[PDB]
Structure 1
Amino acid sequence: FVEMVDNLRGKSGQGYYVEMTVGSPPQTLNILVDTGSSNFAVGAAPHPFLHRYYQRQLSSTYRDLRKGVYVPYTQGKWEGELGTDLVSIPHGPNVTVRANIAAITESDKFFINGSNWEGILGLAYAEIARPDDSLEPFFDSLVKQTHVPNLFSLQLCGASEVLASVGGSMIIGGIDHSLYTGSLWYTPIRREWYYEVIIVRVEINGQDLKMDCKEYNYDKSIVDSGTTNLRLPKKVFEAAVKSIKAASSTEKFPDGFWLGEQLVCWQAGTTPWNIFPVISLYLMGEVTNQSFRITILPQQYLRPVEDVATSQDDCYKFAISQSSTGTVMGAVIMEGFYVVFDRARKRIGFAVSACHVHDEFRTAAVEGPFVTLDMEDCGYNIPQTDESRSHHHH
């Protein structure tokens, strides 16, 4: 799928985007690739952080749905007008789809200054689409309207006045064998809403965290290309950081470092990578009682940032952070691997990425099988609110 290799770009820590065209004539837009949301939404009015926006009135193929949408999150929000229009991905399949499109008219702390993207491509399922699950996500429309297989795969490749440029591949409708090495291991998608998975075990430098495995998935664990960090539930983050601190103890970093709010530096090329441990997440296998592990290096969890005030040093940000909404396997995890979102088979595949950052001593790894007799259920059941229970699903 050569035509789709290297079709993603971005700035380190500001997301990966794909170029898309919307309307007739086609309006070129850079769109955030987000497996953690399900709406196709685009800046549609001026904003200080946008180099352009979607102009609905200028598309001959635009159809107004005469319905607005309000999308609040913890860290930001967007609102807009719903409609449909012709959509294509120039470095994607040779097809045009009529998809739903939310024209963003108002937002707060959503767009990022310098990110070079003006919209979002929510690749997750209809269950989490706003306003409700009847608003068909883009990927669902693409599959229904064309002969494109119900699968996509992501190879996110990790990195003085600007942030480092990043690259990647979104292979729509297939798996490209040049993007990975070794075996491709699959973990079941628990439920089709977010790309929800189950973590059965966590090790830091081969050492088991020894927590009740439901703690790893409290309240869920998701694969999210739209999130930079590896985000872990409070108790898990504490145990993990305690362990990384102990292995790296010859270096006494400020508190701000471990909170992910401060860079730590070393003379160029002298970074002591070997004092930092590998992190292994064991994911539920397709077979009962089996698991496989995905192992990341500090090259994935220590994000490179070039200091204006310290240009001659290699500086890093700690990219593991606390969560109150479960585990989020963001770019920190994804950059080590080629990830296959096999929707047709309700499973997620992981293989060692041909582009992952490593050294001469260690590599990111995907290894299995690991067996457990009479394996306990590691899944958490989210308390059901009266509001969600009341929803009908016709």
Structure 2
Amino acid sequence: SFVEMVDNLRGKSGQGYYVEMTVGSPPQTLNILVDTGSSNFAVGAAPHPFLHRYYQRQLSSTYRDLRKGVYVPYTQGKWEGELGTDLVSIPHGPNVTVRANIAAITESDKFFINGSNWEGILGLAYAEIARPDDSLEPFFDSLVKQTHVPNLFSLQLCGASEVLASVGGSMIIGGIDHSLYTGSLWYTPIRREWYYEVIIVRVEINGQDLKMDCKEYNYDKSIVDSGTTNLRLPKKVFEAAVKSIKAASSTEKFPDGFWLGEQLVCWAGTTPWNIFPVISLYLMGEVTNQSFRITILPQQYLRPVDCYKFAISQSSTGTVMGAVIMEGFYVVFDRARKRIGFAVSACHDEFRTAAVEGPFVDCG
């Protein structure tokens, strides 16, 4: 009920956000990672060391084989499965049940994470990048086609023995829950419908323009992906960023392992938040020379591990606006209007606030 959908996501810091879902008949319960950076509905369907629970096609009276496998390799692992179809529901989402394609994973390589608690993955991006090809209708596409839920979904990623801290959030499917944000919603166009691709026109490491040709901010592409933790930047922008960040926090000093994202830096509640600057990402607006900025605090790019890890890393796939950027913002994936809206979140110190400000006046 939007209301029924509030706080329907759980996660372990840095390990993603999942939503409970059910598959088959009787309903099999599973936690599924919400990924706007992929397009397959893939779930474990065979025993695994990190899996304490998986999809059993055998118990589903409504399961249907497609006889057609799916092999998906990547630099580090893979997941192989058998393609199928079955009934799927989201208990704390819309009150509907649709028949969707399901990639039943039977063999994997560094796919599943130890102790994350999700058993599958919900690829929420377009068919362009779906495996094995674009003929395998992504889950959301089946949802809208069958039920008559509106082509749009929102994500309010929130953030925060010893254990990784637990995170919470909401995935409101079919609409916009106005109590999840304050201020107005600024939309940036979806450049192309494959990944949720957008355009960054300018960047600032607190007031200072990085002054690069904007094509660099999107060198290759720029995407909004909940399935990625860190804010990943093209090598050139990345180094320009760290330099600026190191120059502003210098009244403090740390090792390279820290900036290379592979090392923590701890202080308790003494944390020097204010030495670290805010990062402003201006996104192309709906009107050609109009843009708007989303400003993020160190509380965002310094992920807790008191200890923290630098949540900004280098990339050769382009820019990736991951969880650490989406947090503190209510993000709207308006597939119907082909755009993405940003607004300060209900989720979210007394000197600086994350912000969504506009407007401002060849980047892709």
Q: Name the TM-score class by shorter chain.
A: over 0.9
RMSD over aligned Cα, in angstroms?
0.7
In the alignment, which residue of structure 1 is the partner of 2:301?
Answer: 301
Which SS does the other structure have where 2:195 is aligned?
coil
Match for 1:320 among 309, 312, 315? 312
CA distance in 2, matches of 1:323, 1:35: 18
Q: TM-score, normalised by structure 1?
A: 0.91
- CA deviations 1:46-65 (Å, max 9, x no partner) are 10101100000110000000
- CA deviations 1:132-190 (Å, max 9, x no partner) are 11100000000000110000000000114311010010000001011101010000000
Shift of 1:336: 2.3
Shift of 1:250: 1.4
Which moved further from structure 2: 75-84 or 135-144? 75-84
Q: Provide closer, same or farther for how the CA distance between residues 189 and 28 of structure 1 changes in structure 2, counting only shifts above 3 A.
A: same
CA distance in 2, matches of 1:88, 1:365: 35
In the alignment, which residue of structure 2 is the partner of 1:87?
Answer: 88
Which SS does the other structure have where 2:7 is aligned?
coil
What is the aligned length?
Answer: 362
- CA deviations 1:185-227 (Å, max 9, x no partner) are 0000000000000000000011000011000001000000000
Shift of 1:73: 2.2
CA distance in 2, matches of 1:265, 1:14: 20
CA distance in 1, matches of 2:227, 2:314: 16
Which moved further from structure 2: 70-79 or 95-104? 70-79
Q: Provide closer, same or farther for how the CA distance between residues 143 and 210 of structure 1 changes in structure 2, counting only shifts above 3 A.
A: same
Which SS does the other structure have where 1:30 is aligned?
strand
Shift of 1:128: 0.4
Which moved further from structure 2: 75-84 or 345-354? 75-84
In the alignment, which residue of structure 2 is the partner of 1:378?
Answer: 363
Identity among equivalent pairs (%):
100
In the alignment, which residue of structure 1 is the partner of 2:247?
Answer: 246
In the alignment, which residue of structure 2 is the partner of 1:277?
Answer: 277
CA distance in 1, matches of 2:90, 2:148: 15
Shift of 1:77: 1.5
In the alignment, which residue of structure 1 is the partner of 2:46?
Answer: 45
In the alignment, which residue of structure 1 is the partner of 2:355?
Answer: 365
CA distance in 1, matches of 2:246, 2:184: 32
CA distance in 2, matches of 1:4, 1:354: 15
CA distance in 1, matches of 2:317, 2:161: 35
Which SS does the other structure have where 1:37 is aligned?
coil
CA distance in 1, matches of 2:328, 2:20: 23
CA distance in 1, matches of 2:37, 2:337: 19
CA distance in 1, matches of 2:233, 2:78: 23
CA distance in 2, matches of 1:73, 1:246: 36
Which SS does the other structure have where 1:217 is aligned?
coil
Which SS does the other structure have where 1:247 is aligned?
helix
Shift of 1:72: 1.6
Which SS does the other structure have where 1:4 is aligned?
coil
Which moved further from structure 2: 140-149 or 158-167? 158-167
CA distance in 1, matches of 2:303, 2:79: 28
CA distance in 2, matches of 1:279, 1:5: 28
Shift of 1:20: 0.2
Alignment of 1:10-25 (within 5 A): 10-25=11-26
Q: Provide closer, same or farther for how the CA distance between residues 228 and 75 of structure 1 changes in structure 2, counting only shifts above 3 A.
A: farther
CA distance in 2, matches of 1:177, 1:86: 31
- CA deviations 1:75-97 (Å, max 9, x no partner) are 43111000000000000000000
Q: TM-score, normalised by structure 2?
A: 0.99
Unaligned runs of 5+ in 1: 305-313, 372-376, 380-394
Which SS does the other structure have where 1:237 is aligned?
helix
CA distance in 1, matches of 2:31, 2:363: 38
CA distance in 2, matches of 1:132, 1:96: 25
In the alignment, which residue of structure 2 is the partner of 1:291?
Answer: 291
Shift of 1:360: 0.6
Which SS does the other structure have where 2:217 is aligned?
helix
In the alignment, which residue of structure 2 is the partner of 1:384?
Answer: none
- CA deviations 1:329-362 (Å, max 9, x no partner) are 000100020000000000000000111xx60110
CA distance in 1, matches of 2:194, 2:171: 20
In the alignment, which residue of structure 2 is the partner of 1:340?
Answer: 332
- CA deviations 1:238-295 (Å, max 9, x no partner) are 00000000000111101000011111111x1111111000000000000010000010
Which SS does the other structure have where 1:243 is aligned?
helix
CA distance in 1, matches of 2:75, 2:152: 30
CA distance in 1, matches of 2:55, 2:345: 34
CA distance in 1, matches of 2:115, 2:86: 27
